[PDB]
Design a protein around this nucleic acid. Structure first.
Length: 115
RNA sequence: GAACUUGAGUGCAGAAGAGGAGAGUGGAAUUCCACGUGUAGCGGUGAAAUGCGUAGAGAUGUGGAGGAACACCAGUGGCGAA
C-alpha cells in the first residue's frame, strides 16, 4: 500500500496514455485512452479520457495512494480532461518527458494515407 | 619580329563553406529478446474486421542485441559542373 506514484502523459492525434504506477514503475491500476467498454470514435473523446482516468484513480486509492506525479510530453486530444478527472483526488505534474527521434526520420515513418 | 597589362594564370595575405574520399565515435527513437509489476483488452477505421492478447497482450520499469537515419541548430542559408 504505497503513498506516492506516477502517471505518464504521451499524446498523439488520437492516442494518449496515463497509467497509474508506483515510484519505480511497478503497476497498480491503469489508464490509457478508453478501457471502459467505450468503442469506436467515442473511445477517443475527451469525455472517455476522464472516465478512464477516474477508474484508474479509484483503483489506486484502494492501494493507499494519496499523490500522483505526472509527466508532460507534447499536446494532444484528451490530455487536459484526463488531468481534471485525476484532480478528484489531487496531485502534481512536475516532470517533462518526450517521444521524439533526434533524427528527423530516425526510423522511416509509414506512408501518408491517400484519403 | 618587338612591346604592353586591362584578359587569363602564378606568388603573397586573409575568409567562409552539409565540396569529396577513408577510418572511428555519439545521442534519440523504433523493433526484437529477457526479466519485474500489473490484467483485459490492445490495435485499427468513415464505420468495421482481419491481426496481436489470459500459453498474460497493451501499458509501465530495467537491461541486452541489432540496423538505419541524424531532433533542436536549419535560414528563397551555404557548398558543388551537374
Amino acid at each position: 500500500n504505497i503513498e506516492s506514484g506516477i502517471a505518464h502523459i504521451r499524446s498523439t492525434f488520437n492516442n494518449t496514455i496515463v497509467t497509474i504506477t508506483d515510484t519505480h514503475g511497478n503497476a497498480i491500476s491503469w489508464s490509457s485512452a478508453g478501457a471502459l467498454g467505450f468503442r469506436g470514435s467515442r473511445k477517443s473523446t475527451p469525455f472517455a479520457a476522464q472516465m478512464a482516468a477516474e477508474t484508474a484513480a479509484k483503483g489506486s486509492i484502494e492501494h493507499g495512494l494519496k499523490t500522483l506525479e505526472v509527466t508532460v510530453k507534447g499536446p494532444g486530444s484528451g490530455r487536459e480532461a484526463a488531468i481534471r478527472a485525476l484532480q478528484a483526488a489531487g496531485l502534481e505534474v512536475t516532470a517533462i518527458r518526450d517521444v521524439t527521434p533526434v533524427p528527423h526520420n530516425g526510423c522511416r515513418p509509414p506512408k501518408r494515407r491517400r484519403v
